[model samples]
Target: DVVMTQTPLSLPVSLGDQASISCRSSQSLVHSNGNTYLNWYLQKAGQSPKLLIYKVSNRFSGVPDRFSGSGSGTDFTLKISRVEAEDLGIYFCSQTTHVPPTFGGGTKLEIKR
Candidate 1:
């Protein structure tokens, strides 16, 4: 299974700071078909989750350049450059390579104050 775990569970940051969250999976995200199925999503406060990065680092349509993703195999990262305070939210990394399709515990991006 592609079980996931994301670190810096409670991320504290200020406007203009760069932030990065890491996700680790117990099993590789690459499916039997050979393509990695790891993806990233963001959920704003009181809002539904929305896709941000697909298949590792490809930013979804309409997503800003400030947000980017990296990593391969069992580890991954979602980087937020020049952190915008309005960007506060929860981030989750998921893998669809497995039958169950699992998600990370989630990282909360928030204002330090």
Candidate 2:
């Protein structure tokens, strides 16, 4: 079983700025199938979390191009470009490589004045 840790518990961003969140796993996230099962999600206030990226860099259907994921093994990154007011939320990284998926603590994005 691998544990995940996310840096910068909170991020303050102004509209139009770019934001990046990092997720590091205790062990390699690569599965025997040779694919990384790490996923990225965003949970907005009062709404269920939305899947943003899967298998590292693939964006979920309808996810904005502004959002992208990258990295391999135990290190991964999620980047959001041109931040918008609607983007304020808590982002988390989850791993399906192991049974009973695990998620990082989460990073809360705030609106900067």
Best by lDDT: 2
The lowest-lDDT stretch of 10 consecutive residues in candidate 1 is 97-106
Candidate 1 lDDT (Cα, 0 to 1):
0.80
The residue ranges of model 1 lying beyond 4 angstroms of the native Cα positions read none
- How high a TM-score does candidate 2 get? 0.91
lDDT of 2 by residue, 4-111 (tens): 898678888897888888888888798887888878888888886788888898899988889999987878898888788777888888988988788757788877
> What's the distance in Å from true for residue 47, model 1?
1.5
Clashes of each: 0, 0
- Reference-based TM-score, model 1: 0.89
In candidate 2 the C-alpha lDDT for residue 34 amounts to 88
Score each candidate by Cα lDDT: 0.80, 0.84
Stretches off by above 4 angstroms in model 2 are none
Model 2 has how many clashing residue pairs? 0
